[PDB]
Design a protein around this motif. Structure first.
Motif, PDB file in Angstrom:
ATOM      1  N   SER A   1      50.353  41.264  31.987  1.00 35.52           N
ATOM      2  CA  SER A   1      49.569  40.694  33.066  1.00 35.52           C
ATOM      3  C   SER A   1      48.166  41.233  33.010  1.00 35.52           C
ATOM      4  O   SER A   1      47.249  40.588  33.502  1.00 35.52           O
ATOM      5  CB  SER A   1      50.182  41.013  34.428  1.00 35.52           C
ATOM      6  OG  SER A   1      50.017  42.386  34.740  1.00 35.52           O
TER       7      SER A   1
ATOM      8  N   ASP B   1      44.955  38.884  32.895  1.00 32.22           N
ATOM      9  CA  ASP B   1      43.929  39.103  33.924  1.00 32.22           C
ATOM     10  C   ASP B   1      42.556  39.276  33.241  1.00 32.22           C
ATOM     11  O   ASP B   1      41.574  38.642  33.625  1.00 32.22           O
ATOM     12  CB  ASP B   1      44.277  40.311  34.826  1.00 32.22           C
ATOM     13  CG  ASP B   1      43.474  40.328  36.149  1.00 32.22           C
ATOM     14  OD1 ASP B   1      42.781  41.321  36.443  1.00 32.22           O
ATOM     15  OD2 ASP B   1      43.526  39.346  36.904  1.00 32.22           O
TER      16      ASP B   1
ATOM     17  N   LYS C   1      40.939  36.232  32.309  1.00 35.40           N
ATOM     18  CA  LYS C   1      40.401  35.441  33.434  1.00 35.40           C
ATOM     19  C   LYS C   1      38.991  35.932  33.775  1.00 35.40           C
ATOM     20  O   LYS C   1      38.131  35.164  34.209  1.00 35.40           O
ATOM     21  CB  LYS C   1      41.322  35.465  34.675  1.00 35.40           C
ATOM     22  CG  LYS C   1      42.725  34.815  34.507  1.00 35.40           C
TER      23      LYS C   1
END
Lengths: 288, 288
Positions: free
Chosen positions: A243, A247, A250
Motif C-alpha cells: 500500500s 500510495d 498517487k
C-alpha cells in the motif's frame, strides 16, 4: 569551453575495448584509461560544425558541475576531428531495463524501493540545484558493481542557474517590479517545471514493476493522446504490491501539477525509508 | 553573429552629432547616417573581452527579429576596438518622462490613453512572440515626430523562442512525459512570467499620471519591501481620473498573478479603445 579539450586525440588517452549501447546521437563505447585503467562510458558525437558544440554544452556543464554519489560524474571531454567525446563514469552493472531484459522479469518491490530512494536522492539534488533531468526512465538509471545506482543521460536536461542569475540582476531603484518578481516567485524559482521529473519517476516505477511502461502496447502515435485522455496510470496487478508502493505512485502520478508532491516532500514518504541495498546486490549478482 | 559587423569602423558610416542620454552601461549619441542621413540612437558599450558580446546578443536578437510599428527597430550593429555599437531607430520626441520634466507636469488622461493603447499593442506582440520586456517604464517609452510611441531598451529582456524549441524537441516514444508537458503547459508557454510586464504597465500609467512612480519618496532601500508589504498602489488624487482609468489599473495592479489580466484581455478594455493620437501630437508640439 571550460571542460572540453581542444587539440588532443582522445585515443591517445582512452582505449576502446568494446561497444556498449547505441544512443541515436552516435555510438557509445567501453573505454579504459591507458594510464590509470579507470573504465569509462565514451559518447562519440559527430558534429558537422563548431557552432554545433553549443548544442551539447549543457550535458557537459550539468555533469562537470554536479557532485553527488548517485549522479554519474564527467571524467573527460574532447573535440577532435568533428567529434565530441564525452567520457562519463562507468556503472558496471548495466541499465535498470537492460537487466529486466537479461532476467526476463521485473524488479521486486524491495529492489524497486532501493532504486526509488537512490534515484530520488539524485533528483532532489538536481532540483535544489535548478536542473531538470527531463528524460528520466529505467534505461537512464544505471547500476554500479556495489549495487548502488547512478542516474545518467543529461542530453535534454535544463539548467536554470545562469538565467536566474541573469533575471535577478538589476540596477537603479526598481519601482516597476512586479510583486512576484520581488518575492522570488518567478517560474525559475518555483517548483512547477521541476515536477515533470516527479511524474516520470512515477512511470519509471511502474516500468520497473511491470518491465515496460504504461501504454507500451499501443501504436506509438497514440501514446501522447492517451496520456492527455486518461487518468494517471496504476499498477496492473495491484494485489502484488504494498500500500506504500501504491500510495507513493498517487503522489507522483497526479495531473494537477500543484497537488503532485515535490521530491523534498517525497523523501519523507514511508516507501522510500530504506537504508540497505542488499536487494540490489542480489539482483545484480544473479545477472553475473 | 547574425547581426553584428566585425571589422568596420562605424564612424565611417555614422557621424556623431551630439550626446542624448547616459544609460549606465555607457554613453548614448545622436547619430546620423553619412549616406542616407537617417537619424539613429547610438549605444556605445565598452566590452573588456569577446566572451562579453554574448551578454548583449539578446537585445540585438530581440530588436533584429521584432517587426512592429510601436517597437524600435535595429538599424545597425558593429564590434570595433572593444565597443559594441547598437544603432536603434531614433524617436524624435524624447522619452515620456523626459517630457514630463521639460513641461514640469504629468500627462493628461487622454494622453495617457494613447500611450497605454500604443504601448499595449507593443507588449501584446512581444508576448505573442515569447519576449518579456522586463524593464517597462515611462523612460523606455519613446515619442516619434508624428505623435506615436515606440517602446525601447531591451537590455534585460527575455526571449523564450529558442528554449521552447529546445524543450519541445524529443525522439522515441515518450511514455514518461508529464501530462502538463504533453498539453504544452510548461512555464514557457504559460502566461505567468509574461505578466510581470502587465503589472509594470500599471506603474507606468501612475508614473505618467503623477510624474513619478509610487514610493518615489521613500529611501530606495525600502522600495522593494514596500512593494511586498502594501496593497497594489492607486492614483493619489482619484477624483482627477475616470472610472475606466481606475478600473484598468485594478486589472494590471493585482498581486494574485492569475487574477491579473493578460494583454490580450486588456486590449478589450474600454480604457484603451482609442484611435486618434491628437492628444499626443499636441503634447509634443508644446514641448517644441
Amino acid at each position: 569551453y571550460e571542460h572540453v579539450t581542444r587539440d588532443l586525440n582522445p585515443e591517445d588517452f582512452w582505449e576502446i575495448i568494446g561497444e556498449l549501447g547505441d544512443g541515436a546521437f552516435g555510438k557509445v563505447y567501453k573505454a579504459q584509461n591507458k594510464e590509470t585503467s579507470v573504465l569509462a562510458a565514451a559518447k562519440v558525437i559527430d558534429t558537422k560544425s563548431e557552432e554545433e558544440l553549443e548544442d551539447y554544452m549543457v550535458e557537459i556543464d550539468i555533469l562537470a558541475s554536479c557532485d553527488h554519489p548517485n549522479i554519474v560524474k564527467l571524467l573527460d571531454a574532447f573535440y577532435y576531428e568533428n567529434n565530441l567525446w564525452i567520457l562519463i563514469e562507468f556503472c558496471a552493472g548495466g541499465a535498470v531495463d537492460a537487466v529486466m531484459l537479461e532476467l526476463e522479469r521485473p524488479l521486486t518491490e524491495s529492489q524497486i524501493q532501493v532504486v526509488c530512494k537512490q534515484t530520488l536522492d539524485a533528483l532532489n539534488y538536481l532540483h535544489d540545484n535548478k536542473i531538470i533531468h527531463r528524460d528520466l526512465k529505467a534505461g537512464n538509471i544505471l547500476f554500479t558493481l556495489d549495487g548502488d545506482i547512478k542516474l545518467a543521460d543529461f542530453g535534454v536536461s535544463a539548467k536554470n542557474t545562469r538565467t536566474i542569475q541573469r533575471r535577478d540582476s538589476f540596477i537603479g531603484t526598481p519601482y516597476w517590479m512586479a510583486p512576484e518578481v520581488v518575492m522570488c516567485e518567478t517560474s525559475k524559482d518555483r517548483p512547477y517545471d521541476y515536477k515533470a521529473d516527479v511524474w516520470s519517476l512515477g512511470i519509471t516505477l511502474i516500468e520497473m514493476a511491470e518491465i515496460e511502461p504504461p501504454h507500451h502496447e499501443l501504436n506509438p502515435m497514440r501514446v501522447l493522446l492517451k496520456i492527455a485522455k486518461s487518468e494517471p496510470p496504476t499498477l496492473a496487478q495491484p494485489s502484488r504490491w504494498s500500500s506504500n508502493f501504491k500510495d507513493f505512485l498517487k503522489k507522483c502520478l497526479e495531473k494537477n501539477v500543484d497537488a503532485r508532491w515535490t521530491t523534498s516532500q517525497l523523501l519523507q514518504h514511508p516507501f522510500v525509508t530504506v537504508d540497505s541495498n542488499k536487494p540490489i546486490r542480489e539482483l545484480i549478482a544473479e545477472a553475473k
